[PDB]
Amino acid sequence: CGIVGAIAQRDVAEILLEGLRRLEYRGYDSAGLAVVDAEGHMTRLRRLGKVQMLAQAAEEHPLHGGTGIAHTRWATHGEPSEVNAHPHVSEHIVVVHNGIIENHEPLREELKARGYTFVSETDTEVIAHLVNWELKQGGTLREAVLRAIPQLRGAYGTVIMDSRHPDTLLAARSGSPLVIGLGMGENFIASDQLALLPVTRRFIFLEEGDIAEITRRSVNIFDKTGAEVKRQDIESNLQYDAGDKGIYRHYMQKEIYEQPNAIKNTLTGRISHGQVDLSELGPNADELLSKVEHIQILACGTSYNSGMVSRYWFESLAGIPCDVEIASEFRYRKSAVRRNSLMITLSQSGETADTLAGLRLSKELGYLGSLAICNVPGSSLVRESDLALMTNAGTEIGVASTKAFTTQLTVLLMLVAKLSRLKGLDASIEHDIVHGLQALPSRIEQMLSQDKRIEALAEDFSDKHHALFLGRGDQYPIALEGALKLKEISYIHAEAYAAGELKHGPLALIDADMPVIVVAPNNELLEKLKSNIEEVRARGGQLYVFADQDAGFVSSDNMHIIEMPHVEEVIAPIFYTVPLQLLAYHVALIKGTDVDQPRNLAKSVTVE
Amino acid sequence: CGIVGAIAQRDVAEILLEGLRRLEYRGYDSAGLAVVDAEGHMTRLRRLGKVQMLAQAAEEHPLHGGTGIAHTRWATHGEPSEVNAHPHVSEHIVVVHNGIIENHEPLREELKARGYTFVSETDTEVIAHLVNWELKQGGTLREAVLRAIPQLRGAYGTVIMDSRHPDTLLAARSGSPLVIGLGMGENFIASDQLALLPVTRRFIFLEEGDIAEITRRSVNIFDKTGAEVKRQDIESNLQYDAGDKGIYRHYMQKEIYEQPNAIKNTLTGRISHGQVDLSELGPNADELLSKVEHIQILACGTSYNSGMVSRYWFESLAGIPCDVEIASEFRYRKSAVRRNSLMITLSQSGETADTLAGLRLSKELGYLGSLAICNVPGSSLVRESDLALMTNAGTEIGVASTKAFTTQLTVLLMLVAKLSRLKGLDASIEHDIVHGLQALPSRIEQMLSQDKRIEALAEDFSDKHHALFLGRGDQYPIALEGALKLKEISYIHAEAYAAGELKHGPLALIDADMPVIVVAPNNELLEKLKSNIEEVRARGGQLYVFADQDAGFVSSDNMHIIEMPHVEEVIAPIFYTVPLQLLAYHVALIKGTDVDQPRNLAKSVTVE
C-alpha cells in the first residue's frame, strides 16, 4: 500500500490524489482519502477499485480542506471492499496504514472488551481504535501515539489524524518507508519521494521507529526511545517518469518491445575500451570487489529468477561461489554465512518488503558490503545499500516484469565479467561476455519479428488450464520465469521444472491434454534435453519448443516448433526469455484478463 | 529398465520372470522375454503392461530352452506398447537394454540408409540393427559388439544374443548397472543382485566400458579396446525383502503406518545415552567429519526435498554451510567448489542415474569424501561411495516414498547432531536433537489416529484439479513434499511455494475454487505465516491448515483445520509430513487411481 498526507492552507485533495496515482505501483485494490477543514469538518471518500475510480468520485463531489491523508491498497487482511478501504476511523481518529499489525487478533479482542466496534476485517482498524483509547486517557495526539506504537507488532507506515485538531498529523514508521516533504508554510509525507515531487524536493527520511509530529509550520521527530532528534533533509534531483503505452495496446507490450533500447541503456558508459567499467560505484570499489570470495543474492519472484540465472554465470565463468535465496526464507532462518561474502539484492522497484527485510538483517551478519541492482532511483533498497547499480530501463508499469528482468540479467553479466578480471582470470572471459552483451539489443530486436508465430501458437492455450515449462542448465531459471509470467497474467496454472526432474514424480501429470513449453538452445546440454522431451512425448504430452534453427527439431502433431536464430551462448538465457514473454502476453489477450494489472497483485509488494 | 539374462542347460524362463518381478521397481510399462533351446528355435514373447501380464501369457504357452534374456520397461523413447517392448530384434540379433542411446537419430538414419527397417519408436532398436550390421562385416559377435559400442553415445546396460548361436551371450555396461551371477554349470546377468539370488550368491560387477562374453561355462571380461580384464568376484549376504501389504489395502498405506517402526529401526544402535553414535562408519570417520566446512547434497524428487529440509538444520543448528542441488542440474554445470566440502547423496533405491551421475562427477572434483544415505544395502549408490548410512526402513514398494523420506530425515538430523559436537558447539543442541528423535516414533503413532479426519477432508478434493501448498522455513521443503506426493498419485496439479513467495505473482491463481494446504507448527514464524494465510483468504481461496492444537486457528467456511498434537521443533518437519502423506493417499483413493503404481512412473528412475 501507498500512503500520502498533507497539511496546508489551500485544499490538498488534488495533491493527495496525484500522490496516489504515483503510488499505485503499491496497490490498486481500493483507495481512499480524508480531508478536514479549519472548522474540524471531515469528509471521507473511499472506493473499491483503482485510484482513478477515487479520482472520478472526488471530481463529482470535491473535498474541501487543508489537512488530509490518503491511501491506495494491496489487500492483506480482509477482501478488497469500500468497507475495508483506508482511511479507517475511530470517531475523530483517522488512520492510513502501509504494513501489517501481526498481533491484530489479541489487540482487537482487547479493544472489543473496552467497547469498540470493528466494522472492518482489517488489522489496520486496531490502530485507529487503539489510538482513540489512548487519547481518552488524556494528553496530546503525540503522547497517545507514543503509548500506542509500543503495543503494535509487525510493520506500520502510518499517518494518524484527529479531525477535531486539523493543525497536526502524527506519522510513525516501522519497516514500511515514510518520507516527509518540507514545503513553504506547508508539509507533506508519503511512501516515496516521487509522490511528492509536484509540491517539493526537500525530504527527510524517517528512521526505523521514528515518530514525527507534523504541522503546517514544523516537523519535530522523536526516535524509538522517545528522545527528540534532528533528521537531515536532502535536496532531491529525481524526475518522475509516469510511463507511456506509445503506439501499444498495453504497458506490458510496449515494455517487451522496448527491451533492445532498454538493454542498450543499461550498457551505456559501462563498456569502456572493450572492458566492463563499473567506475560509477566509486574510486575504491575494486578494493571491496577484490576481496569477494562468495556471493549471496536475495530477491523475490522474477528478480529471484534473474538471480538464479546469474548463479550459473558466477560459478562457471568467474569460478565464484554463488547462493541465491528467496528473501523471505533467508530473513527467518539462522544461516551459516560464508567468509568474504558480498550481499546482493535484485529488485525492480527497490520497495519489496521481503527483499528489504533481508538486506536489513544482512547488516548484522558481517558481509563485506551490500550491492543493490535496482531500477528505481531513490528507492528504499537503494538508500539502504552500500553500493548500487541502476538498470536504467525506464519506468516499468505492467505488473509482469519484462525489461526489468532482462536489464537485470544484463547487469549481472557485467558484474560476472568485472569479477573475472579482478580475480585475474583469462581476459577472454570478459571479452566473450562483452561481445555477447553488445549483440543482445539486435539479437532481441530480431526475436521480436517472430511475434506473429508466437501469437498463432498462443491460440492453442485458449481452453488450457495447465502448462509445464522445462529447461536445463542456465535455461532452467528461464523455464521458471516463463511459467511465472504465464500464471501471473493468464491465470493458467503454469509450473516449471528443471527438465531432468520431471520424470521423478511430476511426469504423472502428463496426458494428451497437457502442453509442455521448452526452451532449447543449441548447446552441450541439447541431447540430454531431447531425451527429456522424448520422455514427455512417450506419455502423450503436447510440446511447444522454442528451438535454435540448428537443434534439428522436426514439427509434428504433438510437437510444435518455433525456430530461433542461433545466439551467443553467454546471452542465450536472456534471449530465450523474450518469446516466453510474448507467449504469456498473447495467451492473456486470448483469455481476456487484465494484462497490466492482474487480479490479486500489485507491481511492488511492500509487506510480508 | 530391468534386464535379466541366463545361460543354462535347463529352461531359464521362470528364472527370467522372477528376475523381472524383482526389477519391476525399475519399470512396469511393458515386459518381454526371448528364449532359444540348443538347436536354435527362438520364441519371443512381449506384453504391454505389468510384469504380471508377461507372466500370465508365458504360463499359457511356456517358453522352453536354456538361453534367454528378459526385460521390463520404463518408457523413454516411444509409448508403452507390445511393439515398443524389448527384447528387440534384427533377424538373429536379439537385444534388451537399460539406458538411452542419445545419438539414436543419426544412427537410425544411417541404418535406414543401409536397408534396415525400424519397426518400433525406441532408441534400443538401433542397437540390434547396428550389431546386425557389424556382424555382416565379419568375425564373432564379440568383435561386432566391440565395433558397435564405440558408435553409441549415452548409456547402456544391454545383453545381446545371436539366436543362431544360443551358447554365448554378450553384455555391455555404460553408466547403467550390470552384475553377473556365477553358477555351477550355468551363468546369469541382471540389473541388480537381488534379482539373481534365487540361483546364485556369487557376483561380478562390470566396470565402465566393460564388455562381457558369457557361456554357461566361463566368464571373460574385456575393456573398450578389446583387451581381456580380470574382475574380482564377491559373496553376497544380501536378503530379499519382497514387501507386503500386511492388513492394508495398498503398500503405500502400509508403508505410512509403518513409519514409527521404521524410524525405531533407523535409530537402533545409533543413540547412546542421549548422544548420537555413528561409530558404524569406522574408526577414523571423525578424522574426516571434523574437517568438514561445507556440505554439498545431491538428490532427486522426494530425496531432494529431504536434502532441502536438512539445509535449514545444518546451517542453523551446526552453523555449517550446506548446499542442495537437483542431481541432474549439478552434473552438467561447471561449479565452484568450496574448501573442505563433504558430498552427500540421498537415495531410497540407490539406483537413480542422475544421482549416481552426480556422485561419479564428484570424484574428479576433490571433495573430502562421499557419504551416501541409502535404504538399499549393496545398491549402485552404496557401492560407489566412501561411506554409507542405511536408513533401515525395509523395502518400499509404493512408488511414492513415505517411510523412506522420514528415515532419511531421521539420519540427516543424527548427522547434524554429530557434526555440532565435532565442531564443539553446545551439547544442548545434540541433546534436543536426540531427545526429539526418541519421541518421534510415538508422536507419529499419535498422528495416525487422525487418519479418519484426514479421510473425510480428502472428500473435498474429488472434484478438484489444482492444489497449492504453503510452508515457511524448514516446513517449506515439507510443502514441496506434500505437493509432490499429491501430484504423483492423484494426478491433481499440486504446486508448492515458500509461503511468503506466493504473493509475488502466483497469488493470481487464487479464486474461490482453489484449495490451499498449509503446514502450521507453533513456532516463531507463526504470525508471519498467518499474514500469508490471510492474504490468501482475502482473495477467496479455500484453506486447509494442518496446525498445532494451540496455533489459535478457528474454523470457517473457507478455513478447515486439522489440529495436530504438540511436537518438538527439531522434529516438526518430519512430523508435519505424515498428514500430507495421508491426504495424498486418501485423495488418490477418491480419484480412483493406481496408488502403488501410478501412470507414467517407475519406483526408481534408472536413466537420465
Ligand SMILES: O=C[C@H](O)[C@@H](O)[C@H](O)[C@H](O)COP(=O)(O)O
Ligand atoms: O512478475 C511479477 C513481478 O515480476 C514480481 O515477481 C516481482 O519480480 C517480485 O514481486 C519482486 O519485485 P521487485 O523486482 O520489485 O523486488
Ligand SMILES: O=C[C@H](O)[C@@H](O)[C@H](O)[C@H](O)COP(=O)(O)O
Ligand atoms: O516420490 C516419488 C519418489 O520418491 C521419487 O521422487 C524419488 O525421490 C526420486 O526418483 C529419487 O529417487 P531415489 O530416492 O530412489 O534416489
Ligand SMILES: *CC(=O)CC[C@H](N)C(=O)O
Ligand atoms: C497494503 C498494506 O500495507 C496492507 C494494509 C492492511 N494490512 C490492509 O489493508 O490489509
Ligand SMILES: *CC(=O)CC[C@H](N)C(=O)O
Ligand atoms: C528404462 C530404460 O533403460 C529405457 C530403455 C529404452 N530407452 C526404452 O525402452 O525406451
